[PDB]
Write a structure and sequence with these properties.
The structure is cut from a larger assembly and holds chains A (85 residues) and B (58 residues). Chain A has helices at 19-29, 49-55, 64-84. Chain A is mostly helical. The chains are: A mainly alpha (85), B mainly alpha (58). Chain B: This is ATP synthase subunit d, mitochondrial.
Chain lengths: 85, 58
């Protein structure tokens, strides 16, 4: 008998629907992320950070410092051999 | 009217039709209520139109 009006009721609609939560989630997820690996600070030196940079990053990751640390125990007690026996 | 030779009523109901020749007028009475409905409609419409124009660029 009259004009019905659901073309323009998106005003208080855009809270209730389910991907609104994902939309408001990832507009918050996307702003403070650094763009392209920026602010990396790829070099730092504290007399042993170079040891981590050469040995303990994701790139090198080989067991050799263990080997070095193995030799460290080989370096340790054998000298104590020369202190004891 | 010239069909009925014994006429006697055709001028009567002729005058009855010409009496009710101002038959009855219509109503475009709505100039207070219909403006209210289009006011609510245009309000919701401009709100939604500007909102989706913002949300597309967002």
């Amino acid at each position: 008998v009259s004009t019905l009006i659901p073309p323009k009721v998106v005003s208080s609609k855009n809270i209730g629907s389910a991907p609104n939560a994902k939309r408001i989630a990832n507009v918050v997820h996307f702003y403070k992320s650094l763009p392209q690996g920026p602010a990396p600070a790829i070099k730092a030196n504290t007399r042993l950070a170079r040891y981590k940079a050469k040995y303990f990053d994701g790139d090198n990751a080989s067991g050799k410092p263990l080997w070095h640390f193995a030799l460290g125990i080989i370096a340790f007690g054998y000298s104590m051999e020369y202190y004891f026996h | 009217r010239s069909v009925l030779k014994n006429t006697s009523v055709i001028d009567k109901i002729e005058s009855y039709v010409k009496q009710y020749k101002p038959v009855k007028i219509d109503a475009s009475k709505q100039l207070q209520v219909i403006e209210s409905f289009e006011k609510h409609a245009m309000t919701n419409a401009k709100e939604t139109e500007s909102l989706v124009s913002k949300e597309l660029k967002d």
